[PDB]
Amino acid sequence: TLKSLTVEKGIYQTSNFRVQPTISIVRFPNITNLCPFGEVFNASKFASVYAWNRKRISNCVADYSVLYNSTSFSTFKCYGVSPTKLNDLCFTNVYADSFVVKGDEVRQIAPGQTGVIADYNYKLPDDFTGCVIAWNSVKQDALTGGNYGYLYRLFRKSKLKPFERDISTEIYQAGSTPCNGQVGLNCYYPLERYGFHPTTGVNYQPFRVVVLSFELLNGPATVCGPKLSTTLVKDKCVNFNFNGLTGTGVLTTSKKQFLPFQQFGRDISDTTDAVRDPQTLEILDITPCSFGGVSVITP
């Protein structure tokens, strides 16, 4: 503490230099069924970008190891969380968005990006937590005659708000003259058909994009990474992993009871004073292992 070999006479309060926790415990809810990756990624058909499809995912085990042989991903980007930590985390509200876009429009699927897809088809919130996954789909989405099934909205009066979908087919009049349907000189049908071909360039080749949006620590999580649970340890300083929340603390039974919507409790300092065990609905108080207070009186 003094950063000196020689010490004079003093009370000398000293900072702690000792190790306390040697036990690590993981508490995760009971989930047996694997996440439906095959339905989400390996699907015979995908929605058009303007009519993007949203699928709720719940009560699933998020193991991405299964997809390693089956699928190869051209683009994988996670904004809210680091990709390595996904296995140790639980996702409270995961939603999967599936659509097909041109190969060079994959860049547009990012927060703050601008372009035809970003402005009039799919919009991402600036504060986006989740991962965007894209892969080439030329074999399944392209035909020798050509695939014109996929559609995108070329013209719209205003830019789309984040996570907003419009399927309106109403004629757009660039000119002042009222359109009254009847596409004409200044009136154009808003949707434009894509033209995917097997021999077409990679930029024009079809790409399937899946966007995952989720919150992790906040809220009860029915979706969790593949970590085995361990027996609860209480009244000892232990490292704990409750629903992807990692901390070192003493665990004790808690008199305070959370409301059903509430999953965890935070004190004035904003640290997690109380937590609810995932498997059993018992509130557990979290207490710092160290209490402090040491001084060395030395001649």
Partner 1 sequence: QCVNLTTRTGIPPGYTNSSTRGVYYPDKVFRSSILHLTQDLFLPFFSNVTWFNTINYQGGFKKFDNPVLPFNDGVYFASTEKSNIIRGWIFGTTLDARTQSLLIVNNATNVVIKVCEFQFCTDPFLGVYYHNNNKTWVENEFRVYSSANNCTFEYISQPFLMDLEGKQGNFKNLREFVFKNVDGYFKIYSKHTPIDLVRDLPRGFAALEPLVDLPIGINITRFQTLLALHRSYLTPGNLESGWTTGAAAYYVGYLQQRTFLLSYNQNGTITDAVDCSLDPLSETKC
Partner 2 sequence: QNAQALNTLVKQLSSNFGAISSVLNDILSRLDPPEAEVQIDRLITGRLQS
Ligand X SMILES: CCCCC/C=C\C/C=C/CCCCCCCC(=O)O
Ligand Y SMILES: *[C@@H]1O[C@H](CO)[C@@H](O[C@@H]2O[C@H](CO)[C@@H](O)[C@H](O)[C@H]2NC(C)=O)[C@H](O)[C@H]1NC(C)=O
Ligand Z SMILES: *[C@@H]1O[C@H](CO)[C@@H](O)[C@H](O)[C@H]1NC(C)=O
- When binding is defined by CB under 8 A, the residue of 69, 126, 164, 259 that contacts partner 2 is 126
Taking a C-beta distance cutoff of 8 angstroms, is the pair 218, 262 a contact?
A: no
Check if the beta carbon of residue 107 is closer than 8 Å to that of residue 207: no
Using rule CB under 8 A, residue 68 touches its own copies? yes
For position 199 contacting its own copies by CB under 8 A, the verdict is no
- What's the closest the beta carbon of residue 83 comes to its own copies, in angstroms? 4
Residues 6+ apart with CB under 8 A from 259: none
91 binds, among ligand X, ligand Y, ligand Z, none (CB under 5 to 8 A by kind): ligand X
Residue 84 or 158 with smaller CB distance to its own copies? 84
Candidate residues 137, 229, 254, 272; the one interacting with partner 2 per rule CB under 8 A: 272
Measured CA distances, 269 to 124, 236, 273, 277 (Å)? 32, 23, 9, 22
Distance CA 238, CA 231 (A): 12
Query: In angstroms, what CA-CA distances link 195 with 142, 146, 189?
Result: 9, 6, 17
Rounded to whole angstroms, the Cα distance separating 94 from 58 reads 7
Q: Residues 30, 32, 180, 199: which binds ligand Z (CB under 6 A)?
A: 30
CB within 8 Å of 82: residues ≥ 6 apart: none
Among 23, 167, 289, 296, binds ligand Y (CB under 6 A): 167
* Contact call for residue 82 and its own copies (CB under 8 A): yes
Name the residue with tokens 């897809």.
Answer: 117
Residue 250 touching ligand X (CB under 6 A): no
Smallest distance, ligand X to C-beta of residue 290, A: 36
Whether 29 contacts 223, CB under 8 Å: no
Does 262 bind partner 1 (CB under 8 A)? Our answer is yes
Min dist. Cβ of residue 89 to partner 1 (A)? 18
Counting contacts by CB under 6 A, is residue 184 touching ligand X?
no
Nearer to partner 1, 94 or 138 (CB): 94
**All residues at 6 or more sequence positions from 44 whose CB lies less than 8 Å from its CB, including other chains:** 140
Q: In this complex, which beta carbon is closest to ligand X, that of residue 73 or of residue 258?
A: 73
In angstroms, what is the minimal distance from the CB of 92 to its own copies? 21
Residue in 121, 136, 173, 263 binding partner 1, rule: CB under 8 A: 263
Applying CB under 6 A, which residues contact ligand Z?
A: 29-30, 42, 70, 279-280
Where does this chain bind ligand Y (CB under 6 A)? 51, 69, 148, 157-158, 161, 167
